[PDB]
Amino acid sequence: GLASANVDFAFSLYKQLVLKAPDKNVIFSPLSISTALAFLSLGAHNTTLTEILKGLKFNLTETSEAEIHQSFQHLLRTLNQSSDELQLSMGNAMFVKEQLSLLDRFTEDAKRLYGSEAFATDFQDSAAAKKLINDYVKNGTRGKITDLIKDLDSQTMMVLVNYIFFKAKWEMPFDPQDTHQSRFYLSKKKWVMVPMMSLHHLTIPYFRDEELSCTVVELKYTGNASALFILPDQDKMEEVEAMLLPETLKRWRDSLEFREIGELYLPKFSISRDYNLNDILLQLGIEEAFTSKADLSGITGARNLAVSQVVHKAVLDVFEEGTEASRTIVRFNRPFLMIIVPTDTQNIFFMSKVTNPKQ
């Protein structure tokens, strides 16, 4: 039940992000954002929890919030049970105002269920608070993400931080010695220089949608997950987005057939963007938690705090041998989509839109 809900929440979020940036590169981790939203919900009460759960398409008449938290904990445990071949490390955390005492029980619950940890933050002199949070997140990851918080307003009650960095290896690793510097077409007559990677005489799932005007190819990773690449035709990406639904993702994954594709070309890009989810989540359907009426009695027990900044950065590398690199012709010289899902169940690890690989 959690899979479809996560897909729907992720995809509405992606639609809103596109609405806020029609052509800019889009990258975000659906699983991390959903987990952070549930982490925020862990301290919610009254109608704030029901509003946070109206998002992500949770039908509360059937599924309760406790089962949702249990399912999230189970998913995190399963992901952390994976071996070194595939690792998806996400470590989102929430920062609390130091002038108001945090709840010890909530800290224990966060540590035991979502693995996140929270502490009092010296938000006085926010110029120093930016340095503190940046140092914390730099110590957290190995160094993938830096300068996560762009700025902090004076006397911000709360900030929510969500970060992720994928680490996987292609099932069919690209040969670095065959990487060619070719042209990537921004538009009909606009192109930019970016390296692309090539293969030959390989068999991957492939589907051409003659009724949706797009091409989808599946590239799998050495672990239990895989990636979906979507290559819409020229001047048809908006139609693809308009007719893009989980109803379509289901059909795509149930219509992936192996094909003897001659050559496949994929850009060598490592997208990395930060996203402030204030207005995005406000338009998504959660509003009460941001306007000094959060009623987050689980956080401290005094409803005196509201979330002010939900800033997310999802970093990801598409290189020859996966992250941190050391017949039918398919060429990704056009703006294209990217969906990363496990094969066993539908759940979007990463959803991306690439338009200008140079940036």
Do 2-168+271-315 and 176-267+322-354 come out as alike in CATH topology? no
Sheet holding 204-209, edge to edge: 26-28, 350-354, 336-342, 225-232, 214-220, 204-209, 257-259
CATH class of 176-267+322-354: mainly beta
CB-based contacts of 299, cutoff 8 Å, min separation 6: 43, 96, 102, 103, 106, 305
Q: Which two tokens stand for residue 138?
A: 């730099």
CA 192 – CA 3 distance, rounded (Å): 38
- H and E: helices and strands count for the chain: 9, 17
Neighbours of 159 (CB within 10 A): 22
What does DSSP assign to residue 289?
G
Backbone phi and psi for residue 95, each to the nearest 5 degrees, phi listed first: -110, 130
User: With contact defined as beta carbons under 8 Å apart, do 195 and 267 qualify?
Assistant: yes
CA end-to-end span of the chain, whole Å?
Answer: 37
Domain ranges within the chain, ordered by starting residue? 2-168+271-315, 176-267+322-354
CA 42 – CA 296 distance, rounded (Å): 9
What does DSSP assign to residue 320?
T
User: With contact defined as beta carbons under 8 Å apart, do 240 and 225 qualify?
Assistant: no
- Which one, of 6, 274, 271, lies nearest residue 159 by Cα? 274
User: With contact defined as beta carbons under 8 Å apart, do 169 and 222 qualify?
Assistant: yes
User: With contact defined as beta carbons under 8 Å apart, do 161 and 148 qualify?
Assistant: yes
CA 88 – CA 76 distance, rounded (Å): 10
What are the start-end ranges of the H helices in the chain?
Answer: 2-20, 30-41, 46-54, 65-80, 104-109, 126-140, 237-242, 246-253, 278-284
The yes/no answer on whether domain 2-168+271-315 falls in CATH 2.160.20.60 is no
Q: Which two tokens stand for residue 54?
A: 């109206």
Pairing status of strand 159-167 against strand 309-315: parallel
CA 151 remoteness from chain centre: 22
Task: Give CA separation, 257 vs 44, 221, 231, in Å.
Answer: 45, 17, 16
Q: Tell the residue number behind the tokens 């293969």, with chain if given.
A: 199
Q: Tell the residue number behind the tokens 């989808």, with chain if given.
A: 216
User: With contact defined as beta carbons under 8 Å apart, do 168 and 86 qualify?
Assistant: yes
Backbone phi and psi for residue 31, each to the nearest 5 degrees, phi listed first: -65, -45
Resolution given for this structure, in angstroms? 3.0
Neighbours of 126 (CB within 10 A): 19
| Angular region, 324: left φ>0, alpha ψ -120 to 50, beta rest | left
Instruction: Provide the CB-side half-sphere exposure for 213 (13 A, CA).
Output: 11
Q: Is 208 helix (H, G, I), strand (E, B) or coil?
A: strand
Query: Dihedral of CA 124/126/131/137: which sign?
Result: positive
- Which one, of 48, 189, 38, 52, lies nearest residue 114 by Cα? 38
> b vs e for 195-205, b when ≥16 Cβ sit within 10 Å of the residue's Cβ?
bbbebeeeebb
Helix (H) or strand (E) holding 161: strand 159-167
Task: Give CA separation, 67 vs 47, 70, 71, 162, 222, in Å.
Answer: 18, 5, 6, 23, 31
- Which one, of 66, 61, 59, 29, lies nearest residue 44 by Cα? 66
CA 267 – CA 332 distance, rounded (Å): 7
Paired strand residues for 267: 196
CA 13 – CA 30 distance, rounded (Å): 8
CB-based contacts of 326, cutoff 8 Å, min separation 6: none
